[PDB]
Amino acid sequence: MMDKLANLCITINNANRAQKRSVVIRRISKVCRLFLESMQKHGYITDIVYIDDHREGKAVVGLSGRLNRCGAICPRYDVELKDVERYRANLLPSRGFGHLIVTSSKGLIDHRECIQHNTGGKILGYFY
Amino acid sequence: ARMYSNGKGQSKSVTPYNLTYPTYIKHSKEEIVDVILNLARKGTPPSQIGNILRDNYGVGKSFAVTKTKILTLLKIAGLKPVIPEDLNNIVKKCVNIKAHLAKYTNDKSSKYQLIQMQSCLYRVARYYKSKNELPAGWKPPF
C-alpha cells in the first residue's frame, strides 16, 4: 500500500497542473487532516469538507491560485533546531516565502515558529 | 492483489451505513436465536448459517436483531469447534489433492497446486497458534 501523506500530495499536484479547481482525495489519516488544516491557515487552500464514509475516509478540497507545489518527505528525519535551516535551504525556492512543516510536541508548526518556540522535531513536508 | 496468483478481481458485497432493527420480519428475537443454535448442532459452518438466515428467514447480516456475532454466540452456547473453520477447510483441500495424486501420479499441475495449498496452511496455523487458538505442537493430518 502507498503512504497516505504521499498520495495526498500527488493528487493535488497533478490536478493543479491540469488546471482543475477542486479534487476528492480517497484515503485519509490523522496527520493528513492536520497538514490540510495548515495549508488553510496560510491561504494555500480555501475550503475543506470531510466525508465520514466508514471506509477509511475521504476529503473534498478547493485549491487557490497561490499554490505552486507541495510534497511529503520520507522517511521522517529527526532534527535539532540547529539542523532545520539546512533543510529549509534545500527544499524552498527563496528566503522570503514558502513553508517547511515540522511535527513537534506542540503539533504541526512551520520553520519560523520553530525559532519562536525553541524546538526541533521530525520533518514532514513543504509547500510554496 | 491475490496471494498465490496474478488475480485482481473486485467482487465484494456492500456493508450498510446503519443497521436498525428488521421490523418487516415475522419472528421474535428468541426464535431467531433458537434457529441459529439448531442449525449449529446439526453441523453447519457459520458462513452457511448466515446464508440461510438471509435467504429463508429474511434477516440481513444476522446481527441487527442479536447485538452479537455468530461465532461469539456459539462460544456462549458452548458449541465451539476443535479447529477454526478456515484452517479446517484448508486441511480438507490438501487431503483431496493427495487422494487424486495417489492414483494419478503423473499430474504436474496438481503437484504445483499442492505446494501452494500446503504453504497457505502453515501461514494460517502460525496466526492461530499465536492467539492461543491451537496447541503449540499441533501438526497437519497428513
Binding site: 520520507c74 521522517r76 528525519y77 | -
Partner: protein
C-alpha cells in the same frame, strides 16, 4: 533500503559497490609495490648495462634512444628513455644513473614510445640538462 532503521543494510551494500572503481580496486587488490618508481619511491638508482634504440609508433617515423638499467633496490632490469638532443653521448656502459617517472596516473607509456615507463635524470651525480648543454663537466 531507504527505511528509517535500514542503516546496516545500506552501509554493507554501498561498501561492496566501490570495488567496481579501478582506482579503489588496484589499491585494495592489486600489486602496487612491483614498480621501481611508484608507491615505493619517487626516484631510483641503477647501473647502465646496455645501450638500445626503439622505433616510434605510427604515424611518426623515428628511432628513440633508450638504456637498459639494473635497479639496485629490486634486482630487476628495466628500460629507460634518455631525453635530450645529444643525450646518449653523455652515458658510458657501467655508469650510474638516477631514473624518474613519466607523469601518468598508473605507470603508462607516453607519446609515441611503445612500452617504456621511465626516463634518465642524472648521470654520475650530475644533471643531464647541464651535461648536454655544456654548462658542467663529467666528474672524471
Amino acid at each position: 533500503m531507504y527505511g528509517l532503521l535500514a542503516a546496516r543494510n545500506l552501509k554493507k551494500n554501498r561498501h561492496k559497490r566501490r570495488y567496481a572503481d579501478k582506482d579503489f580496486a588496484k589499491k585494495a587488490r592489486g600489486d602496487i609495490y612491483q614498480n621501481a618508481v611508484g608507491y615505493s619511491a619517487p626516484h631510483a638508482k641503477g647501473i647502465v648495462t646496455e645501450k638500445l634504440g626503439v622505433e616510434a609508433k605510427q604515424p611518426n617515423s623515428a628511432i628513440r634512444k633508450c638504456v637498459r638499467v639494473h635497479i639496485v633496490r629490486l634486482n630487476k632490469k628495466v628500460i629507460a628513455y634518455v631525453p635530450h638532443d645529444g643525450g646518449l653521448n653523455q652515458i658510458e656502459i657501467n655508469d650510474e644513473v638516477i631514473v624518474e617517472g613519466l607523469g601518468k596516473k598508473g605507470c603508462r607509456s607516453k607519446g609515441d614510445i611503445p612500452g617504456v615507463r621511465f626516463r634518465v635524470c642524472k648521470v654520475q651525480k650530475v644533471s643531464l640538462k647541464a651535461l648536454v648543454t655544456k654548462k658542467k663537466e663529467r666528474p672524471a
